[PDB]
């Protein structure tokens, strides 16, 4: 159940959106990406200076859909804080690592996986074709290298491997900036 | 999930429509076309002078449905800016290239495919027969030639091939006018 | 997705406020009943102001199509017909049925006047009714009157699998004008 | 059925949320976790000092989803009171034991199970989720937290979370999973 | 069909008058909803009586105990009214109402048979046998009716149907409602 | 389709005028809804009459008895109006309306046959043990003025009655004449 | 999987056991099950009217009407019908177990027997017409009377026990009179 | 896929049945139990002296259905050799431990779990209710104590725990007699 | 489709089984494993000396099911030749590498992937067993023994998404020879 | 419907009876089940007679590259010559298998339709794992190289043509080098 | 229901007719139907290359590609293929009826013949890939040319008629040139 809040009736997610909070709590597909892109564009229109908070609990998904969110985060004027709760895998971790520098977080028991799987599924027919022709893996690897400070050689080895990181190991890797302290 | 916004309660897409923004974020079929056409007609009725912003993240779809959107864009008085976020393939890239001259954009990591397949999604038999009439393909090729500045010979070869273009390659092709560069903070101090 | 507009209406409801009806699907009884109700409602609001019927339809039921046709002819306001995309079977019949001088098509629209004998899902009695030879003769007679073509020519053409461009539909007499883009108007 | 309350129309759960009450009445998956996390974040934004009441009737679920709720409870400023009504098993009993010290309760006939099943409990976790649990040794972390929150040794917790054991509300209090068994108020 | 009332759906409008309808099988969703309604009615007024109407074939022991415990926990008196049927956990909840405020309509059917359970989760079933919840049910029914534990044990193990009058004589209800 | 009324759905708007529509098979959901509507109308006004329109093929004896008992329990008079059909528990509820206030439209069909067996297994079990058939027959005897012997024979037979035949039987007080 | 047995003659496992006068009643009792069991019983009598028949029971019960069709066929035919409970015999399954030939009603050591005859048709096994038939013809009283005769218990005791949710071990079922022997392992 | 063998056409399992081999390769339910019991009864009828080979790859299942197989194995005259290939969990390990003494085997990479879960799902309610009579759990524990030679106290603790054993650990436990060597 | 062969009617797979050929042409689950194990046991019973041919076209599957086939190959007396046609991934490549020494083959265009994914072909119980019994370490040790590569190299490669040509698999030690087409040289 | 044939007792279905005459019909989309069945039929026919020709009839819209390569490799591995006959259509992997028949023994009926376009994905006929290997192992380049060798066209021409949506008549396929002869109605 | 025939060997009704060189095309024409009919035609030629084959037709038609596969097989094989319309021959079914051996194309008195070749994949029996082949390779023009040659009608008349919804009796089909004779009841 998703409850209602009256200030004017909003659902829980709508009420959080009023406080510049966006929840990315599922697999990344085109519908999810279009919704997140629209919420990011809307928050910038409301206030171009105030920070945005993107909570991440995602097993990942479509590279195309993830790149649409990634590009929107980088395009907009507001700083987008990324907070991992639960899990950030595949495009999920890519989006976590893509938050404003110094504003990338994860709760103590959060699990981070940088493995970028070969195919999709979710990604469509046309989507998988572009990934390999346009060498989008190399683009993902290059961006991860820039955002973590790790060499491209190290990123290439790690994105190709099934590896799970704790929030502390993710911080040491350069994916997040701080492990959220109970306060 | 599609959230609610209270100014009066709208969903996220309805709230963006208030700012003259349309999202074409799926395969193009008759339902999608009818909704987009209706949104374009509605925005013209509100203000016939103010620009419209059409965001595109589409794998393409029906030629007939895609031509209904194309014809509506060209029929209406306002300029329709096109912005590719994610992907524009088949009718998707045709609609991207159909935006107002100087106002066709793509985000840096967007993927553009001009291949017009020979359809795919669920549609009616007559529409499928119409989608494959050889005259419409020549019509698509002629419009793409006019909108990109490329020769019809080059367009014919490229729409028949499985080709993926980066946002920069799409700009060099003439399918977009600019690759969107991130918005720099505090660029106008004397006014703002 | 069908968005919301607050002045709360959905996109189609907001267009209905401006006397615009969208016939964007196959024609069945539910579609016909909805279109008939929208036409009756618009007449009740203003019996003088024109109505705009946008068509993007592969056609459908003859009975359902005749219910829309009869409502268009019965009401006092002029019903303009605008083909966007496609108008086939009962869809092209309804396009040709718009107010004289007010039947349009966008440049890339596709028109098919073929009235299939076979076909769409209707009830047993309705399928039997859609197959009465007398009703095909009435369709042909109305198309002859509305296009200015002979009944002999209409009989041959509604029996054939033929696709027409917007310009060819204008030359045929199914539409009165091909709508020209706003970029070309001085 | 979930009834409506007018003060402004809320459903039963929305009306309880106004009084800082959250109901965790199902299996724990990502959708449930995201909803509970959002409700916790919302209540902190309203008032960072006032207590929150988390009612639990759950057979458990995903370790990852459960840890997202656990981490949010510990992160926020308000004290989160935990009240077991009915059942708290697997991640449900872990969340019950995670409430503010001195503010963990259970109704007299509530059933508490600390058994943490090997996989994703009753098929509540994805392949990606279960894979992380044994690489990141999340079982050892669950056991360490339960040891700290109950006051039991890690050796005892390890033995008990591996066993199919059901506890009454009184046995849960003696274990250190709750602070008090709620007595009928007069 | 559930109609709308403008001053709500029919159940929401009755909730305004402190009336709760338990008209289905008892599962976790039903129990969580009833518990929430009871907690809400106590928050509104801790002194005014609550009316719980019962037409239920029973259900989950765990879900039923959640409702039972909430009734006993709250300050207001919870009146129980059987309309139609009260079987298994339904008859247990009917006997659980405030003393002197347990009722049934003349043609209501009451079954105290607590089956061995027909949906309840594997984990729920496992709990009931380990925690001997059947013995607890019997002990509470015995206290609520005034019957011996031996008589309750025999009767909750048997397939028996009682009229409203027989249920009053048993002690599961206090009065058979007379047409007003 | 169920339309909207602005001063509600069609049934909600009729409920405002103290009208209840029993237009389907009688099961627990139907019974709980009808019982709740009856309780709500009594709370609004305990003196004003209630109108129960019936178009039902019948259903569950347990669910039907819940409606029957609520009609008899409440203070307002419940008028019963058969439109279309009243069979099994439906005809039982029609005969249960306030004395002098039981009606049927001219072309309504009434069947008093109470079939042997939609009801759950637990419900069917109850009916046989508690001899609910005898109770139904006794109530029908009291409400029609027919002997229990006649009712027993007729509820066991497949018999259809016109609105006029139902009036002659004592199931209804008047056949509503076009007025 | 149900395997094949070749003796230029191919049978499935159940068909091969039928050749040795063995019938498997391994499911809920409905009309299709009853008609199949009745047909197998009639066929075995036609083959040899003197040789014993072995009915294996692993059943949660079912339809009273379907169960009575099997019961009546067992009593009608000339061969003695031995009943063997493997696993479970509840409701009509335990009624059929108790209906086996005198001295020839068996259970494996870990079998579970329930004599409870549920009010309806043991979990949607009987139709509306079947349920109607049972109460008019007072079939419950007939079941109780037959169980009283076959176990040696009083009708008063049977009435109380068929109305209760009770599970019996193979040894408790022997002491009750529902079976005659708890099967002994064969060695060498 | 299940292929055909002509000697007379059999499927793969029918051809193995000719050599006194039974495959228990799935979850244990009533249909599985009735089929295995029938195969065991058939093989005894063919030859009451020759050994039977029961191959096990099972995650377990119904206690009632499993006890029907167990009782049949113990009732019949032939020795029933049990061979775990892959997995033997819950009723599957119980049936593995039930084979003739000195004739219970497991392949090197086989996984054995003696945990007997509390509950059950396709089964009937009565069967489900029977599967959790506290008395059957005590009987399972007593039989496991006798078949392995471990104390009842040790069995009670281990059947209540989520424990996985290698083929060698299961031999050490007394559930099998030998780990089959390549 | 699967055609019939009369010598006595067999399907295509049954007729190949007569020539000691087994086809592993799908994902590996318990049903597949039980069928392959049964076929291997049957062929040994027919002739304990004659070689068996196991053709592999599989994307892999369950570790437990794959180990059941692996253990049966090692247990039986006949040499089991392995031939990859198409693909051998996950447990499929493990079984390819498990064939008799000098008798492991792949067709020139066969694709081999040694990546052993962390997890959806396995049951709840099957996944649980794998991380408790450290089956991944056992798989890695066997691959190290059968390829002649170090344990550390195998650990790195089974954790990576890597595709190998038939020639690269031969160089790796996963097969002994790439089967060459008939060299027709006039 | 697939009828039964009795030779005399011995009952075959239509495809089984054709298999007795060394005929294989590839009349559907190419997936792993289709490939495994065709591979098994090819292996069986070689075991029967390693010298006599095999006839592979093709009416296929194509399918999985992995499944198609399994058939291709089996054709090249076995001793008998595999004649390829296009009836109806040969698209994607179907046209690849048609071009892969024994030299001088690749045919098409006059109204057969050949498409050499090798679509990017699979489409929809291949799994994630299957699609993944395609790009890593550059199977497209291998397909193009084999088509270049079997037709006699340059790799540059093949690369352009397999990337395009092109349909060829039986005669155009012969001129291209995908077949050796167009079958003319026989006397 | 499809019954069994035992010759004293068990065949179904269609298998027993196949023994007498009879093929029944009694459904919509798709790839599975075409592959089965092609296989039956190839099988009958293998049995006897001289004896006539009888193709009974009761079909609403279907796929152009699937229909062309049957058409090409009929023309390729050595035996004469007699065509007999029972019930209906529409779309590809009427093209196949007209394709039978000259002098050996028949229809029963009450059979209905429709030569209309619908634009798409005629009753959605054709795939997107199939529909693509037809418009590019101008298969409609090839159909019309063959039909013109087989009936003796002008190409203009055939073009007009295969584009229209038209129905013919057995006698009208004979006069059109689509069949050679209307079958007269056997004496
Ligand atoms: Cl674990
Ligand atoms: Cl009290
Ligand atoms: Cl219990
Ligand atoms: Cl022993
Ligand atoms: Cl693992
Ligand atoms: Cl590719
Ligand atoms: Cl065409």
Curated annotation (Swiss-Prot), chain J:
E.C. code = 3.4.21.92
Q: Which reaction does it catalyse?
A: Hydrolysis of proteins to small peptides in the presence of ATP and magnesium. alpha-casein is the usual test substrate. In the absence of ATP, only oligopeptides shorter than five residues are hydrolyzed (such as succinyl-Leu-Tyr-|-NHMec, and Leu-Tyr-Leu-|-Tyr-Trp, in which cleavage of the -Tyr-|-Leu- and -Tyr-|-Trp bonds also occurs)
Would you say which domain of life the source belongs to? Bacteria
Q: Name one GO biological process term.
A: protein quality control for misfolded or incompletely synthesized proteins
Q: Which GO terms describe its molecular function?
A: ATP-dependent peptidase activity; ATPase binding; serine-type endopeptidase activity
Classification via InterPro entries: ClpP (IPR001907), ClpP/crotonase-like_dom_sf (IPR029045), ClpP/TepA (IPR023562), ClpP_His_AS (IPR033135), ClpP_Ser_AS (IPR018215)
Q: Which UniProt keywords apply?
A: Cytoplasm, Hydrolase, Protease, Serine protease
Q: Which GO terms describe its cellular component?
A: cytoplasm; endopeptidase Clp complex
Q: What are the coiled-coil residue ranges?
A: none
Give the active-site positions: 92, 117
Q: Where in the cell is it found?
A: Cytoplasm
| Described function | Cleaves peptides in various proteins in a process that requires ATP hydrolysis. Has a chymotrypsin-like activity. Plays a major role in the degradation of misfolded proteins.
Recorded hits in NCBIfam families, A to Z, give: clpP, PRK00277.1, PRK12553.1
Of which family is this protein a member?
Belongs to the peptidase S14 family.
By its UniProt entry, which HAMAP family does this protein fall under? ClpP
Assembly, in brief, is: Fourteen ClpP subunits assemble into 2 heptameric rings which stack back to back to give a disk-like structure with a central cavity, resembling the structure of eukaryotic proteasomes.
Q: What is this protein called?
A: ATP-dependent Clp protease proteolytic subunit
């Amino acid at each position: 159940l998703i409850p209602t809040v009256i200030e004017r009736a909003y659902d829980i997610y709508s009420r959080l959106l009023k406080d510049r909070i966006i929840m990315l709590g599922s697999q990344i597909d085109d519908n999810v990406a279009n919704s997140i892109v629209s919420q990011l564009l809307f928050l910038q229109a409301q206030d171009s200076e105030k920070d945005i908070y993107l909570y991440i609990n995602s097993p990942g998904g479509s590279v195309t859909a993830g790149f649409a969110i990634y590009d929107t985060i980088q395009h907009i004027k507001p700083d987008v804080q990324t907070i991992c709760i639960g899990m950030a895998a595949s495009m999920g971790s890519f989006l976590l690592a893509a938050g404003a520098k110094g504003k990338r977080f994860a709760l103590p028991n959060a699990e981070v996986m940088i493995h970028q799987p070969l195919g999709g599924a979710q990604a469509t027919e046309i989507e998988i074709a572009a990934n390999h022709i346009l060498k989008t893996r190399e683009k993902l690897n290059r961006i991860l290298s820039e955002r973590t400070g790790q060499s491209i050689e190290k990123i290439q080895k790690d994105t190709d491997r099934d590896n799970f990181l704790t929030a502390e190991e993710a911080k040491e890797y350069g994916l997040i900036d701080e492990v959220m302290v109970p306060e």
